[PDB]
């Protein structure tokens, strides 16, 4: 009962200003849970989409800015792919860009520029061991479309160079999902 | 956003006994509404399946009996395809089988035999004019997956020969549907 | 040390009668543990078959009935494939057949008819996350042939339409297994 | 239900010293019973390996020594293939090597050298007549994997030249077996 | 950021003498953790090698002896591949070689001979279920190069025949690793 | 033990304002030492990356600005490649652009434009003679990854036209390195 679909949600991300003169970077991670994309259903069907299982193929993270083109004190940052539930520690003003040498780096031009990241995230099966599997579309694991406790997929962490001005963004996380086993119910009345 | 799926529901159909000696037939129609197949959803999504439109391709009506093989006073009936919202009048003991000369006839062996009917129903757009369109899979009309008032598709009418014994059936109406325009909502929290 | 073999066991399943008139279905799941198929061995060898690991390829569930052909009040049910340790809740008289729209459905003709289900079950590695892997015969996981705690494989759930008469069955669960690493011991005397 | 497997066991063989000056040989036979390789099972299954029949294809006898390389008073011996349950009589100090002219001879270099013998043994069906059959893999007899009385296969006899020093060996008898008719039991509980 | 490399470490293994006359074997397992191969780093980089993940491809265990060629009371042992965190119990003088019939056996010639074992170990993800995956180089799991708690890979167990003399060995465990995601840090000053 | 990798670091470069009316240029050089890219390691391993030697293949210098697009008093500059440890003298307001006629010139559009320079630097082996070798990837010299005194590679010098407004930049020096002779240590405990 395969059905590939697409899901999206928009949320905000703000970077407060600073007084420091040096190039100081701010670090924040990003997690992907499907409870934020699928609302809870009603009645005999738990969730909105009538299916049992799912597996997330790709995720297009998009940093739609809110900063004008005439804004000064530009900078430069970095976004990586972190597939293990253990990011670099959250920081407000870090003296270096930790995601600058990562092999999965893609530069973040700031403040008014666009930045997209299309990748295959991996679930969190054991936070202690933090094991995942390679990208194989045929042998990818199927997970259950739980009712209230779907597991957190993972795979992005950022580093934004601070500035004198508030860098406000609007982030759209488009998710590409593959379901299976159409399990719709149909009680009478 | 095409997604072909399948829907089903089981309901009962009983044919009370008679005292008449002649071959007397009992006539009853059958209508197909999708509100009986899709439950109402919850929240910002009206129905269970997150789509806007639909068009019913085929319908496999199945007369799963409840009558044993050792049951006497067998008979013979007929099932037709009636695509116009105007069936033969419901009757308890009719002296003839009105659906015996219809071109869409398929014999109903009774009481303990199986009978399936796979056909393409047509919606009811004007009960007065009762117009429908031919079977063309490319130019078939798209209807809206309404919230509480989806229109009645139509296309089967039966004629069961009465008997001394109660002929009880269990009827499974399997529906083959084609949706479009995935319209899932996702409010926060 | 590969050795494909076959294992089987027969157990009973009874469906008590009812007084209700409506079509009411009874729901019950089915789990597959290999401790029920392999007895405990003796001495330095823990189990009967001298091997370390195993992986269950296929499972042929068979509903051999005990109901005669002359039995009335027939019905119709459904059997699905549920690979996640979370079935539909057990029920005695449910007003609908929850496994009627599942994509892995195969109709159960009742009461005196045969019904077989051949599929590839999946183990239960995390009851919370309930993750499994696709069907790939080359990359399938090897599990350990434990001594007292082998994990529960899963993958069938049924829905039997109740009746006035007791529908008794005899269920044969034939399991197709693949072992490895012949680990026989041989102490003296 | 064919399953070719391998079985092994290690036991010791010691050759006490002598005072005689001449070249004096010591003769000892070797028998192969499968009760020494398969332990007794437990419960409804008699033996460890769940099968009914067997036929021994080959046997790799190995004389793993325990004598150092710096050991003097070396010698020379002989190992033959004796398929009839009637070896040369056991002797402590025999003035000749009886297995020196046998057509199945293979020289035993002593004391610290390795010696392997790979051959097809024959069972003992009648100790009086002592008849066996040729080596044909297709028409070889199937024997029953008895519970306590499996018959003695046969086929090796040795002749070790005595010495002033104790020649100690460790003998590994690797057996290559072919079973059939998987007969595993499975009582409940 | 793939980088195949090699890691090694040497440790000792001693087998104390005995007074028993029979062939008595001593059993001891072997585990492979990468904390013993990678030291802890310094500063913003946790470990020596700047990477995030790893997966162990192969492991060449080597039993470099310390026993001279002129040493008597030789013997014979066995080494197997045990991929499940459940070895045969450690024993000082066991009356049989439990790893003598294992399909992954390779004979250990003793005391002064060399013995190498090249195989693909498997991690320990659940000690209770003890599940692993087959050898596929493309779909092998990536694990995280943790800071203090890397998981124990597994896959060798031995059986050494005891002797009158102390059999001392020096064991070199060469590990072949594949890293990914170069994560080097570079704070100023 | 070849391993090509990439290293990066971000630092700032500010050009204070002026009161002069003429086109006045400001000159500043740029040196490349690898101690700024590799931190010091810990323990038996001196540096982070476990290798002995290195040779820098290419260097992508990037002038990521901090100046808005709406900034007036634009200008024009020049960046050259200076492979000899003897740049044009540092100057605050020079009446000419000395790097305007250099054959390795590439124009610097100012203030808000991007400027990248990808070239092969050369080490400083003798500051007096200032000799280097041509670009040949096969015969390039290997240098030692020293502990505290790695030699200064060289190869860029700039000329920025002064302005009434402060031209602030953020400079990212991406370095492409080739190591050899994996020299990781592994003391016990």
């Amino acid at each position: 009962g395969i059905f590939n679909t697409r899901l999206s949600r928009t949320f905000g991300y703000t970077i407060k200003r600073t007084t420091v003169k040096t190039p100081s970077w701010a670090v924040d991670m990003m997690r992907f849970n499907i409870n934020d994309f699928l609302p809870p259903g009603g009645g005999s069907n738990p969730r909105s989409v009538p299916f049992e299982y799912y597996r997330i193929r790709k995720v297009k993270v998009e940093f739609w800015p809110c900063s004008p083109i005439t804004q000064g004190d530009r900078g430069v940052g970095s976004s990586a792919v972190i597939l293990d539930d253990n990011f670099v520690t959250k920081a407000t003003a870090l003296t270096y860009d930790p995601y600058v040498n990562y092999s999965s780096r893609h530069t973040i031009t700031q403040p008014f520029s666009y930045h997209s990241r299309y990748f295959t995230p991996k679930p969190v099966l054991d936070s202690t061991i933090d094991y995942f599997q390679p990208n194989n579309k045929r042998n990818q694991l199927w997970l259950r479309l739980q009712t209230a406790g779907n597991v957190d997929h993972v795979g992005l962490g950022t580093a934004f160079e601070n500035s004198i001005y508030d860098q406000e963004y609007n982030i759209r996380v488009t998710m590409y999902v593959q379901f299976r086993e159409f399990n719709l119910k149909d009680p009478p009345l």
Side-chain angles (χ1 to χ4, degrees), chain A residues 58-152:
Chain A
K58 296 281 180 179
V59 174
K60 196 177 282 285
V61 181
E62 297 170 305
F63 294 87
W64 293 102
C66 292
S67 302
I69 287 172
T70 65
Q71 184 167 334
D73 201 41
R74 304 194 276 175
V76 69
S78 292
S79 50
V81 173
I82 300 292
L83 307 167
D84 31 5
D85 203 60
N86 249 120
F87 305 93
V88 176
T89 309
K90 188 170 181 179
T92 300
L94 181 58
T95 59
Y96 60 104
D97 181 10
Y99 303 102
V100 73
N101 283 322
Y102 278 54
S103 296
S104 65
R105 178 177 64 82
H106 282 74
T107 302
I108 302 162
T109 307
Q110 285 167 228
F112 54 80
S113 290
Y114 176 69
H115 184 66
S116 66
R117 290 247 44 178
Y118 188 68
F119 61 95
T120 299
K122 306 296 181 193
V124 171
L125 277 15
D126 190 72
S127 66
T128 306
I129 297 164
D130 292 317
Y131 72 93
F132 65 93
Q133 61 179 175
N135 295 13
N136 195 322
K137 292 184 105 54
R138 185 178 294 278
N139 245 113
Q140 187 178 359
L141 293 172
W142 292 95
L143 308 168
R144 167 138 220 156
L145 198 267
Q146 304 281 133
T147 299
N150 285 316
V151 73
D152 299 314

